[PDB]
Amino acid sequence: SMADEATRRVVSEIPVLKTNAGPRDRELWVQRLKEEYQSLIRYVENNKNADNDWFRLESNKEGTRWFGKCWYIHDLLKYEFDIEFDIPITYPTTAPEIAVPELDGKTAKMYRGGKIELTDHFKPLWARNVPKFGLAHLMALGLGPWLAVEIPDLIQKGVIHH
């Protein structure tokens, strides 16, 4: 299918994750976090090599709260946005909800508190890949393409300024 090839083209060089564990799962959660960090840092290193180093992420000590920055280039100007999310208890079967709080109420494709609204195809795509996708895949397949529609639109409409 076109969808299968599009997914593989975007994620094929991102390390796949393995462990079915969420924040409550003790030593299995510690192992899941090793897969999350190994997958994120390989994605970041690929991004630098492709001149598309577009985000930084850190977590709290337990790896249950994530926060950082993404950058979006439009007409060669670089825009920075703070991003944050909580790991749901039912992770990795349930996908985290990325929030961009400074854009809260500035686009229709977003819920209260700045939680971005992905298309209906993102959720079944995550579901069919559990537990192989993690935070690197949420950034690559979720926030990435969301920015590539919403940021150009909001610059166009005079809603955000450099």
Contact of 160 with 78, CB cutoff 8 Å: no
CB atoms within 10 A of CB 110: 18
Which experimental approach was used here? Answer: X-ray
Token pair for residue 67? Answer: 């926060």
Total number of residues shown for the chain = 162
Residue 54 lies in a domain: yes
Residues with Cβ within 8 Å of residue 154, at least 6 apart in sequence: 103, 106, 107, 160
Residue 146 lies in a domain: yes
Residue 161 lies in a domain: no
| DSSP class per residue in the chain | -HHHHHHHHHHTTSPPP-----TT-THHHHHHHHHHHHHHHHHHHHHHHTT---EEEEE-TTS-EEEEEEEEEETTEEEEEEEEEEPPTTTTTSPP--B-GGGTTSSSSB-TTSBB---TTHHHHHHHHTTS--HHHHIIIIIHHHHHHHHHHHHHTTSS--
Measure the CA–CA gap between 3 and 6, rounded to whole angstroms. 5
Kind of pairing between the strands at 77-86 and 65-74: antiparallel
Residue 159 lies in a domain: no
* Sign of the CA dihedral running 10, 119, 21, 59: positive
Report the number of distinct structural domains present in the chain: 1
Measure the CA–CA gap between 139 and 22, rounded to whole angstroms. 18
Domain containing residue 135: CATH number? 3.10.110.10
Measure the CA–CA gap between 59 and 65, rounded to whole angstroms. 5
Residue 81 lies in a domain: yes
- What is the extent of the structural domain holding 76? 2-154
Residue 121 lies in a domain: yes
Residue 162 lies in a domain: no
* Sign of the CA dihedral running 85, 86, 87, 88: negative
Residue 160 lies in a domain: no
- Give the burial class of 95: count Cβ atoms within 10 A of its Cβ; 0-12 exposed, 13-18 middle, 19 or more buried: buried
